[PDB]
Write a protein that binds this ligand. Sequence first.
Ligand SMILES: COc1ccc(CC[C@H]2OC(=O)[C@@H]3CCCCN3C(=O)[C@@H](C3CCCCC3)c3cc(OC)c(OC)c(c3)OC[C@@H](O)[C@H](O)COc3cccc2c3)cc1OC
Length: 128
Amino acid sequence: GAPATVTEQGEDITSKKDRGVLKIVKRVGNGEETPMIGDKVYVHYKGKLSNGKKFDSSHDRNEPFVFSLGKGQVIKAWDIGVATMKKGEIAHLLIKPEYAYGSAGSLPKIPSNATLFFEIELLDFKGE
Ligand SMILES: COc1ccc(CC[C@H]2OC(=O)[C@@H]3CCCCN3C(=O)[C@@H](C3CCCCC3)c3cc(OC)c(OC)c(c3)OC[C@@H](O)[C@H](O)COc3cccc2c3)cc1OC
């Protein structure tokens, strides 16, 4: 399924080329612009532990998930991954623990050393 496809086909978007954040594009976005650090971004998403024991969506609230890039609002993998996305893009990300919750984990949802999978749709972004 989607997580195994990212492992086999995903691009390594990390600087260190350690396969910590792997990406595939499921839908090409519009234009060329991608968001800057400090930009307010609006997404829909679905996330899961790569073994599927826990799941989370924005579609629960039926409202965008809003966060600002580079402000420490989200796991490091989201700052890296969303920064690469165009408006309208849908991407899949597979994330190693070093770019998410690490050895500490985050009880009760996230065990130590957890690989995460996300689908993210970048709806819009705006300047601070
Ligand atoms: C700067 O570093 C951080 C900043 C913030 C956080 C808090 C967690 C933060 O969630 C995330 O960063 C990612 C990406 C954005 C969407 C939510 N994320 C999750 O990891 C999900 C996971 C995904 C796999 C399946 C289980 C849920 C998430 C993790 C949560 O805690 C660890 C969590 O509880 C807070 C959560 C949703 O709740 C969703 C919703 O019920 C809350 O109302 C809003 O949650 C967040 C809101 C903002 C940021 C994050 C969570 C952690 C950070 O580093 C460890």
